[PDB]
């Protein structure tokens, strides 16, 4: 398990939660340097437990998918929340068994889903830690319109910094004060799998994608990845999705 507590969190003590995050996802190969993600595990080994705390030392425990850093749920006291959707129903049957009671979500755990639960896009939804301290408070309550909302910020705070060092640092700038996404953030989240198929394909193609991977850059330009020598790929993405999750 991993854990991160917000009372007394910084951009350091969050930079070493993002590192044990990434290092709990078992990989047996890199490419291009980067770890890639399993195809499968099999039972309760593929799901690793997030203990959050928020600044009054209340916890929810997060379950996360190995192979592609989905959430599938969360615990918070003696309540099991779940996606509505396979995967996270398969996850019920092996993470949080003890809990008194196990709702399922009124929405599957995907961006536009939640958007529409939450009312608004995450272009609008202010993000940090102070923002991940609120979502850890609202989701100990149930409020699905409300849970929508703080499961943007937790997805965004947790698996998308995970994935590239570029949102893990965006958050770290947002460590005492929330702010909506950048552009080039939305861009990179919607942009993993693609970016990981690509970078998967460069292995037999002398490092050139087959298809190119249009990004949004830090200047709010739109810029065009063909291959792995891109800053991308060399610097900012962490994790890989396997092909054949793909
Ligand atoms: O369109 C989206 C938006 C978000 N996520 C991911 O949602 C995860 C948690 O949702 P879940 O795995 O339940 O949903 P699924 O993506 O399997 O539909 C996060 O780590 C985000 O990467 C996603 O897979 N697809
Ligand atoms: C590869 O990408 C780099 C970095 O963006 C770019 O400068 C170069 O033109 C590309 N080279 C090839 C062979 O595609």
Redesign the pocket.
Known sequence: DVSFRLSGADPSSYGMFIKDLRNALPHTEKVYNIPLLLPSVSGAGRYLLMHLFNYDGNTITVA??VT?????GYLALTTSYF?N?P??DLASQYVFRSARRKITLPY?????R?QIAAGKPREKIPIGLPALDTAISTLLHYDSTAAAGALLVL?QTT??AARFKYIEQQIQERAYRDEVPSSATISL?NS?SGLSKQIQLAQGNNGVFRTPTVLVDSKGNRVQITNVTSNVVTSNIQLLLNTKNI
């Open positions: 996360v998918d592609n850093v989905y959430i599938m996606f959707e995967a996270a599957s755990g995907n961006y536009e939640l997805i698996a998308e989240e993993w």
